[PDB]
Amino acid sequence: GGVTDALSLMYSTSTGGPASIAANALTDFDLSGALTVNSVGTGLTKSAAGIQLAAGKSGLYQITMTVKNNTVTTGNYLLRVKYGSSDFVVACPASSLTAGGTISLLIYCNVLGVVSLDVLKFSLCNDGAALSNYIINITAAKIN
Amino acid sequence: GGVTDALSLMYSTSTGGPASIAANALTDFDLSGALTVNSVGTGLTKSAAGIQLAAGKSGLYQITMTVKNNTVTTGNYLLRVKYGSSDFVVACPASSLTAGGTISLLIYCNVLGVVSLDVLKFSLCNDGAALSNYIINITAAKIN
Amino acid sequence: GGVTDALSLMYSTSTGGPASIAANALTDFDLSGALTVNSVGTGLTKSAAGIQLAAGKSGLYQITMTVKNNTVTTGNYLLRVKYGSSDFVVACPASSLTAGGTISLLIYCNVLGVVSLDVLKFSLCNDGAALSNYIINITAAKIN
Structure with a gap:
């Protein structure tokens, strides 16, 4: 039957x-000016803080953030997602064939019902160069 | 209630x-000769181009591709998934304990309704050696 | 409608x-003493072997394991998930900004209905240092 809430x-x-x-x-990342590719329900909305979770929306969330910046093919792409006191990270070695990360x-x-606390935060970078030629996609969906 | 379409x-x-x-x-990868481990619905089907999405099947897709090639334990495993104009990548350092990537x-x-455009494409490799001893798994599921 | 089974x-x-x-x-990892953050249904339960799948629960599973050990910022974090004869791996370069992996x-x-075979196994480490300051999260959900 699909999911009740989602934002891409x-x-x-x-x-x-x-x-x-x-x-x-x-x-x-301030995500208020990001392009909404797809939206489902009203529980997940973009904001200057990241992606806000509406009250009463506790549960399981599937999240993905990817980046391509084809002009930066060296170093490692560092990605991070945070929620409350937890933060999750990954490092992705850059190459001409893999100019980005996931x-x-x-x-x-x-x-909790504290908008400034109930938010998925996103950030990424390259450890050796600035990124000014990127396409980043962030999708979150409540699966339960 | 599960998902409406999926292919593993x-x-x-x-x-x-x-x-x-x-x-x-x-x-x-030409996936026409891949072994179908599990199949749900008819919206996702294997083909010489990758995994085809049937008409009317726009939505959110969960995708995973993994590889193990235990004889190649050096360099980085490069993985890529594409759909339309978007492509997603990741690099996974190889080791004897992690002979592959995800x-x-x-x-x-x-x-769009253009079979040759509406297809999930998959590819991977090792940046320093050829792979001829691999087990690759590709699963896609429409979650909304 | 959510998922039928899940364990975090x-x-x-x-x-x-x-x-x-x-x-x-x-x-x-022996997961019998892990803290249950969230639980749905009875098909997925922690044990000394990992996460057990109850009989009749064949299907598609979404799994995530993450680690943060901020005192170890060098080498690569190696993560592995196994199920039956299949095993999946990934390596994540460590840094002060990404002290862990995903x-x-x-x-x-x-x-199969053989408790000792129907279990998701988890393990991770750093290839250059021991971890004694970690926060690890493991979540599994049956999506079909």
Whole structure:
């Protein structure tokens, strides 16, 4: 029967992202100006903090964030997703064939009802170069 | 209630894969001869191009591709999944304990109704050696 | 409508994990003493072997295991998930910004009805240092 809530975004320098994502650092992304590719329900909404979870929406969430920045083919792409006190990370070695990275997660999210706390945060970068030619996709879906 | 469509494949030199996957290159996999491990519905079907999405099947898709080739324990395993104009990648450092790699994604797929365009494409390799001893699994499920 | 079965665990030295996870080796985790963060249904239960699948529960499973051990920022974090004869792996380069790793999978699980065979096994480590300051999360959900 599908899922009750979901949000899929496209993030780039033209769609709400920083003109240049600094090298070797992780600053959470303001997602208010991201392009909404698909939306289901009203429990997940973009904001300057990341992706907000509406009250009463505790449960299991499937999350994916990917990045391609074909001009940066060296170093490692660092990706991070946070929720409350938990944070999840991964490092993806860059190459000409894999100019970017991916992080996917199935996590349990407890919603306290404090908008500034109930938010999925996202960030990524390359540890050796700035990114100003990226296509980033962020999708989250409540599967239970 | 489960999902409406899903396909899980097992790909090897004995089940439709190349006798030898060339090193440091990414050629999309012909999946017509892959072993169907599990199948749900009729929206996702294997083909020479990858995994076809039937008309009217736009939505959210959960995808995973993994590989084990225990004889190749050096370099990085490069994995890639494509759909339309988007492509997702990841690099996984090889070791004797981790002789392979993994890429998982939750992406939104828009189905235009052009079989040759509406297809999930898959490819992987090792950046320093050819693979001729691999077990590859590819699973895709429409979750919304 | 959500999922029929799911289990989300929090594993640490205080919640059932080894006082010290040996370097460069993969020993499956005894999950009997892990903290149950969320539980759905009765098909997935923790045990000394990993996460048990109840009889009649064959199907598609979404799995994620993550680790953070902020004091170990070098080498690669090696993660592995096994089920029956299949095993899936990934390596995640460590850094101060990414002190850990992630592995996510959508796999098909055939349940034979042999408790000691129908179990998801988990293990991870750092290839250059022991881990005694970790927060590990393991979540599995039957999506079909």
